[PDB]
Each structure stands twice: as C-alpha cells, then as structure tokens.
Design a protein around this ligand. Structure first.
Ligand SMILES: *[C@@H]1O[C@H](CO)[C@@H](O[C@@H]2O[C@H](CO)[C@@H](O)[C@H](O)[C@H]2NC(C)=O)[C@H](O)[C@H]1NC(C)=O
Ligand SMILES: *[C@@H]1O[C@H](CO)[C@@H](O[C@@H]2O[C@H](CO)[C@@H](O)[C@H](O)[C@H]2NC(C)=O)[C@H](O)[C@H]1NC(C)=O
Ligand SMILES: *[C@@H]1O[C@H](CO)[C@@H](O[C@@H]2O[C@H](CO)[C@@H](O)[C@H](O)[C@H]2NC(C)=O)[C@H](O)[C@H]1NC(C)=O
Ligand SMILES: *[C@@H]1O[C@H](CO)[C@@H](O[C@@H]2O[C@H](CO)[C@@H](O)[C@H](O)[C@H]2NC(C)=O)[C@H](O)[C@H]1NC(C)=O
Ligand SMILES: *[C@@H]1O[C@H](CO)[C@@H](O[C@@H]2O[C@H](CO)[C@@H](O)[C@H](O)[C@H]2NC(C)=O)[C@H](O)[C@H]1NC(C)=O
Ligand SMILES: C#CCN1CCC[C@H](CN(CCOC)C(=O)c2ccc3ccccc3c2)C1
Ligand SMILES: *[C@@H]1O[C@H](CO[C@@H]2O[C@@H](C)[C@@H](O)[C@@H](O)[C@@H]2O)[C@@H](O)[C@H](O)[C@H]1NC(C)=O
Ligand SMILES: *[C@@H]1O[C@H](CO)[C@@H](O)[C@H](O)[C@H]1NC(C)=O
Ligand SMILES: C[C@@H]1O[C@H](O)[C@@H](O)[C@H](O)[C@@H]1O
Length: 527
C-alpha cells in the first residue's frame, strides 16, 4: 500500500507503469480549505486536518471557468478544456514521484496558463509522470482560482482583496516546503515553471516577498509580467469589479454589501457576466487578472524590476516562433483554421483595429510601416505572416526579451531559448507555424512515449529539452552533457545570446528580433 503521512493527515497514492519503471502518483491532494460560500473571493485558508486516509487516485475538480467551444470536436481547441467536473472546490494539487522513492529529489512545480481565466492541472499535456521517470525529479502541479473567482479586486478589503489566485499558488508552494520531504523531495531545491499566464505567474513570484523563500529558480515559457496583457492597474481592476456588480444586480453603497451580494450568485451567473466588464476587448483580453493589490504586489512590477527589488536567482526564459497566430482565428477577419488564410492589406488594417483598439490612426500606420518591408513583394501570404508577427512580437517576444535583459542586469545568470519546431501532431494548419503553448508536450516528454506516433527526431529533441530543464532545475545551468553538446551561453545585455531549439541544429544566435523589438520598446510607447 502506497501511503505517505503529511502535516494534514495520511494520503494514499497509486503506481503507474512508465518506460519499464514505476512512478508513484498522488493526484488531487487538498492544500487549502474549499473557498465555498463565505470563503468565496478571500485568500485561501490553510487546511486543518482530515482524520482518515485520503485516497489521491483521481484528478480533482478544475476551478470554475468558461469553456472554449468555438470548434466542437476539434482536438486543437478542446485539448485545452478541463477534463474534470468544474467546481468552486478546486484547490487541489498533484504529485509524481520516481520509484524507488528518492532521498533528496529536486522538485519541479508546474503552473498552468490560460489567460488567468481558464486552465487546469489535469490536462494530458501536463502529465508529470515522464519527467519523474526519466530525470528522477518530483513533479507538482496545483489548481488555482481563475477569472473573477480568482482575481476580483476590491483593493484593501480582506473580503475580495485581489490576486487570490496567486495566493493559491503561493499556498501550494508553502505546502511543498512543509510536506515534500515526506515524499522524497528537497524543499531547498524547488523550481517554478509555467507557460503563458503561468509564466506571468512565475515571474510575479520573483517580485513578491512572500514567495521569495518558497522556491529556488524559475523557468518562464512564452510570458512575463511586463507583457501588455498581464497586470491590471489598481483602479482599472476596481472599475471592473464595480461593473460586475452592476451587471449582476449587485450594486450597493457599501463595498462589503457588493461582495456579500456576489457570494449569493450562482457561479454560472458570474462566469457569463465576466466578458462584459470591459468596453473594448481583444482576443488577448484579461478581464480579471493580477493587479497591484499592495499585499502580493507592493508596487507596479516594472518599477520593482528597474529597482532590482526581486529575488536574485537563475532563470530560464524563452518564446515560440509563432506566438501570435493562435489568437488570429479567434477574431481577426479573413482568418480561419480551415484555409491558408491569405489576407489583403485592407484585412491587415482591420486586424490591427481588432488588436489595437485604443491606438491612434497614426499608431496603426506606424505598425504597418514597420512590418511591411518585404523581402519578396508577392509572396501572397505577406500580410498573413505580418499580422501574426505583430501580435506575437507585441504580446510575447519583446516582453520576454525586455524582461531577460533587465533581470540579467542585476547579476544573475539568465538563459534564453527560441523554440522553432512545429510538432508533427499539431492539430492546427501549417500556416499557424509553431503555435503558442505547443512546446509544452516536448517539455513534459510526451514524445518520449514510443507508442504515440511522434517522429524519432521529435523524441531526440524532447529528450534534449527534458534533460536541459531538469539540469537547470538541479544545478542552475541548462546543460545537456559535458561532451558532444552545444553549450547554452548566458544572456547578457550587450551580446544577448540565445539558443534555438529544433530538430535540424541547435545554434547560438544574438539579438533575437532586435529590429522589431526596437519598435515596441522605444517608439510605440510614444504613440
Ligand atoms: C479510501 O478507500 C478506502 C477503500 O479503498 C475506503 O475505505 C472504506 O471506507 C468506507 C467508509 O465508511 C467503509 O464503509 C468501507 O468498509 C471501507 N473499506 C475498506 C476496504 O477500507 C476509504 O473510506 C477511502 N477514503 C475516503 C476518505 O473515502
Ligand atoms: C538535502 O539537501 C539539502 C541541501 O540542498 C540539505 O540541507 C541543508 O543544506 C544546507 C546548505 O544549504 C546545510 O547548511 C545544512 O547543514 C543542510 N542540512 C542538514 C541537516 O545537514 C539536506 O540535509 C539534504 N537532505 C537529505 C540528504 O536528506
Ligand atoms: C477563410 O475562411 C473563412 C471561413 O469561412 C472565410 O470566411 C470569411 O471569414 C471572415 C472572418 O471574420 C468573415 O469576416 C467573412 O465574412 C467570411 N466570408 C464570408 C463570405 O462569409 C474566408 O473568406 C476564407 N478566406 C479564404 C481566402 O479562403
Ligand atoms: C551540468 O553542470 C553542472 C555544473 O554547474 C554539473 O553539476 C555538478 O554535478 C555533480 C553531480 O553530477 C555534483 O556532485 C557537483 O557538485 C555539481 N557541481 C556544480 C558546480 O554544480 C552537472 O553534473 C552537469 N550535468 C551534466 C549531465 O553534465
Ligand atoms: C554527438 O551527438 C550528436 C547529437 O547532437 C550526434 O549528432 C547526430 O548523430 C546522428 C547519428 O546517430 C545523425 O543522424 C544526426 O544527423 C546527427 N545530428 C547532427 C550532426 O546535427 C552525433 O552523432 C554524436 N557524435 C559523436 C561522435 O558522439
Ligand atoms: C474559455 C474561453 C473563452 N474563449 C474565447 C476567448 C478565448 C478563449 C481561449 N483563449 C485564447 C485562445 O488561445 C488559447 C484564452 O483563454 C486566452 C485568453 C487570453 C490570453 C492572454 C494571454 C495568453 C493566453 C490567453 C489565453 C476561448
Ligand atoms: C469604468 O468603465 C465604464 C464602462 O463600463 C460600462 O458599464 C459596465 C456595467 C459594463 O456593462 C461595460 O461594458 C460598460 O462599458 C466607463 O464608462 C468608465 O469611464 C470607466 N471608469 C474608469 C475610471 O475606468
Ligand atoms: C508499487 O511499486 C513498488 C515499487 O515500484 C512496489 O514494491 C509495490 O508493490 C507497488 N504497489 C502496488 C503495485 O500496489
Ligand atoms: C486493503 C486496502 O484497502 C484500501 C484499498 O483502496 C487498497 O487498494 C487496499 O486494497
């Protein structure tokens, strides 16, 4: 029988067969009191104790969220939908352990993304059993509250203070410190990693003094807190909370009356109204997400970064080649998952209106001029590839590069990667290239499963990425082997070296997309 004693009671796990070896999996351990009823919208409350043996043998409930239903039956969109029942009782976590039980294992903690509105730890592309089997690390993932139930902000008031989802993540990190030794783990070797809004979350733990002792190192994939979609100003967050009151018949004169009204609504009543708290909106809109609450974030993150008031440790950062394409089919005209989506100069300018609603007519004309210095004039797909580049450069790549420079300027090793391989199994058309979030299967080693119809070059690439990530976690250096392997050099603000990751050749390069990023950091802010 597989039983571990925790500070909150005993828990029973389950064995899994992986690559001829055993992995011990504890799915669905509770780490906080269910935020139900009076607890809705408050910081998570520490768990007391159950008085029995909790059976952690099935993934628990994903948190309450809307569901992407644009393409019914399409794996490319539905693989991101939660594969468990939705519920407000969702603060659970999952632990994978190599067998035999390690003595002092390094812990990797996965934080899913989903624009702070969606996501669950129970998806198949987040299965952590291969990482525990192949690199003998312990893998942990937790559910956190998303959307208004996670980030409704009345700043100052303990009844809806903001960043409740980040406090959910933080409380799960506290659980790892207090309990992971009972599983074989070293709480002095904990590595946060996540993608998209999960990366943004990871980058925010580097700023929050409460998280500074709960982890060692960080990996940020396709995201950072300086991305334009990641942090709401103090009063925009408030102006959105008051609008959700009015939309649900909950406006009052007392703040706590607004909240106690909002505790009596159905979850579905709140979910259906989330999309209307904002006037404009883009495919990249984050209605309720992290904000400057004064507790977790004591100041605007860019200031804290510039002043060097953050955890000094090693980071690993990167982006995918075609980050923006995924958002084009969800709102730009002339784009469909079912053609090659070749578009005109008029449709390009309609797209720019969709993604830059408040930008002046001159700003849209400046973005157009900077992104149309064609190599070949036709090339009919020029405008299709320029719009994906605008969206990805503005929202993901130039944020990641700007965060890496400024972070490395304070004396810690940063390593930057550029993921350029499209997966043979990618359910989306070839014109969308290396999409947002499709490096993930490689990081979790899904191509290592020989029975899964991945190519031999995709197993080698993913065996290489898994090794480097596990090495970075263990030793702060993303090496593969000492011999016969490309060295990954540190990112430095002058040379700005990065490593490309693909199946042909991993190469060292310099100043990723510098001519495009120069536009977004030094000319667009003045429009
Ligand atoms: C975990 O599983 C065990 C069995 O797999 C559960 O044990 C049963 O508990 C019920 C509850 O009263 C008893 O009626 C059964 O006789 C028990 N059977 C055995 C074989 O022990 C246990 O309750 C489960 N844990 C939880 C929290 O539900
Ligand atoms: C697991 O490794 C850690 C270090 O990563 C050991 O913990 C402490 O490490 C510090 C240095 O950071 C030393 O000053 C302490 O002396 C260590 N603690 C002890 C009790 O010696 C930890 O001991 C290891 N745990 C094992 C091997 O079970
Ligand atoms: C690509 O596929 C779409 C899907 O039908 C085609 O349809 C247009 O899609 C845009 C997207 O917002 C709409 O604004 C248009 O109204 C749609 N057209 C019609 C006639 O309904 C699109 O035309 C296709 N383009 C190519 C070149 O195949
Ligand atoms: C990757 O590089 C690190 C150096 O940063 C190597 O770390 C050493 O690992 C051994 C165990 O293999 C430890 O006993 C040493 O204390 C480590 N040294 C340092 C300075 O961290 C690591 O082994 C390398 N990995 C590979 C596969 O070559
Ligand atoms: C050193 O390791 C490299 C991996 O980076 C090996 O390179 C590949 O080797 C296979 C043969 O097993 C070829 O099919 C690939 O085309 C090679 N990739 C390249 C050249 O980028 C290499 O074989 C190893 N060499 C030694 C001497 O150990
Ligand atoms: C669920 C839901 C709502 N539905 C329509 C809005 C888009 C949503 C899916 N979707 C974007 C599509 O690509 C994954 C997101 O939830 C989303 C939204 C904003 C994001 C912002 C930054 C990074 C990832 C994001 C993902 C599906
Ligand atoms: C706050 O937001 C206002 C717009 O909100 C409007 O009303 C709510 C109930 C929603 O239905 C929303 O779609 C509407 O557009 C602005 O009018 C107001 O200026 C904003 N104020 C500040 C300070 O941001
Ligand atoms: C689980 O695995 C361990 C070692 O891998 C084994 O000794 C134990 O019997 C297994 N328990 C099962 C299969 O219930
Ligand atoms: C005897 C034990 O009771 C409980 C079960 O869930 C275990 O699998 C085991 O059989």
């Amino acid at each position: 029988d597989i039983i571990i004693a925790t500070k909150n009671g005993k828990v029973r796990g389950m064995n899994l067969t992986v690559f001829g070896g055993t992995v011990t999996a504890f799915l669905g351990i509770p780490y906080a009191q269910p935020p139900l009823g009076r607890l809705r919208f408050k910081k998570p409350q520490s768990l007391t104790k159950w008085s029995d043996i909790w059976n952690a043998t099935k993934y628990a409930n994903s948190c309450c969220q809307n569901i992407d239903q644009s393409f019914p039956g399409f794996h490319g969109s539905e693989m991101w939908n939660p594969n468990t029942d939705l519920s407000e009782d969702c603060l659970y976590l999952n632990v994978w352990i190599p067998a035999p039980k390690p003595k002092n294992a390094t812990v990797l903690i996965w934080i899913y993304g989903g624009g702070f509105q969606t996501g669950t730890s129970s998806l198949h592309v987040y299965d952590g059993k291969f990482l525990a089997r192949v690199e003998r690390v312990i893998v942990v993932s937790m559910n956190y509250r998303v959307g208004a139930l996670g980030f409704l902000a009345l700043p100052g008031n303990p009844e809806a203070p903001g960043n409740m989802g980040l406090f959910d993540q933080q409380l799960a990190l506290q659980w790892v410190q207090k309990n992971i030794a009972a599983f074989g783990g070293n709480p002095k070797s904990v590595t946060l990693f996540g993608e998209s809004a999960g990366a943004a979350s990871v980058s925010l733990h580097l700023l929050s003094p409460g998280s500074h002792s709960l982890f060692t190192r960080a990996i940020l994939q396709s995201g950072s807190f300086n991305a334009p979609w990641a942090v709401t100003s103090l009063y925009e967050a408030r102006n959105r909370t008051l609008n959700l009151a009015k939309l649900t018949g909950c406006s009052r004169e007392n703040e706590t009356e607004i909240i106690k009204c909002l505790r009596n609504k159905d979850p579905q009543e709140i979910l259906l109204n989330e999309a209307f708290v904002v006037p404009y909106g883009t495919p990249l809109s984050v209605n309720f997400g992290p904000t400057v609450d004064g507790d977790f974030l004591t100041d605007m993150p860019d200031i804290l970064l510039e002043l060097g008031q953050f955890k000094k440790t090693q980071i690993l950062v990167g982006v995918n080649k075609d980050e923006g394409t995924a958002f084009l089919v969800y709102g730009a005209p002339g784009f469909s998952k079912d053609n090659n989506s070749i578009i005109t100069r008029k449709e390009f300018q309609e797209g720019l209106k969709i993604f830059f609603p408040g930008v002046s007519e001159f700003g849209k004309e400046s973005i157009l001029f900077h992104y149309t210095d064609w190599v070949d004039d036709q090339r009919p797909e020029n405008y299709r590839e320029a719009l994906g580049d605008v969206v990805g450069d503005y929202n993901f790549i130039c944020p990641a590069l700007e965060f890496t420079k400024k972070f490395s300027e304070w004396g810690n090793n940063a390593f930057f990667y550029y993921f350029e391989h499209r997966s043979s199994k990618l359910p989306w058309p070839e014109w969308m290239g290396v999409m947002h979030g499709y490096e993930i299967e490689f990081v979790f080693g899904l191509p290592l499963e020989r029975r899964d119809n991945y190519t031999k070059a995709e197993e080698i690439l993913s065996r290489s990425i898994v090794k480097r990530w596990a090495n970075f976690a263990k030793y702060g250096n993303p090496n593969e082997t000492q011999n016969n392997s490309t060295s990954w050099p540190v990112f430095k603000s002058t040379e700005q070296k990065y490593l490309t990751l693909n199946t042909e050749s991993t190469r060292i390069m310099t100043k990723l997309r510098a001519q495009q990023c120069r536009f977004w950091t030094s000319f667009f802010p003045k429009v």
